[PDB]
Design a protein around this nucleic acid. Structure first.
Lengths: 98, 91
DNA sequence: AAATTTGTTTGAACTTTGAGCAAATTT
DNA sequence: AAATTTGCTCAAAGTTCAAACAAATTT
């Protein structure tokens, strides 16, 4: 057959391990790391917009990368992400990618 | 100046931060590399799923389970948070 | 000159929100 | 015993959507 590829390992980054060998951990794990790192560096300072902070840090490069792929075609890009053409264009405005 | 970041090692064994947005690119760069014009259909709800999950995973761990502190921390409604927790089944 | 995409608008379908309250749980 | 948090449900506020369709651009 084909071999399973869990959604965990659909999107993946390159890491180095204890034996200095290149392996591919999930993006999940990068996100986890970053948050662990963000809390530790926080020091009892108040936070109240973590969702939008993360979302910004993820939408931008998804958009960046997807528009490169469709050589700048929105209809394709929006179809490709699964979102209305108008909201893509709204998101794009928000980060100044138009 | 950039708050969301991850650690990296160079060949000369030095650790060093880089923004998470640089990871997300790589992932996508890689996702697209390994497709070969196979249609992609629902990519926004995919990455979102791969980012919501460990964000919820970590903020509950941080707020010791406190749904209320968690929502307030994330800047979303207390009900939205319940719904997202059903979505990935983290009851 | 043919097809396809942009840039808009419209209204309907859906989602998030703030508040309210009893009942359960933590302090 | 007091304070806070859960689990719910209403409504209003806000976003996403598909569909139009000229006007611009690309095949």
């Amino acid at each position: 057959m084909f071999e399973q590829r869990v959604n965990s390992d659909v999107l993946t980054v390159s890491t180095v391990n204890s034996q200095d060998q290149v392996t591919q951990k999930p993006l999940r794990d990068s996100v986890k790391q970053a948050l662990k790192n963000y809390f530790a560096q926080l020091n009892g300072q108040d936070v109240n917009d973590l969702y939008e902070l993360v979302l910004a840090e993820v939408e931008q490069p998804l958009l960046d990368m997807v528009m490169q792929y469709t050589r700048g075609n929105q209809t394709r890009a929006a179809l490709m992400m699964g979102i209305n053409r108008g909201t893509l264009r709204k998101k794009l405005k928000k980060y100044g990618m138009n």
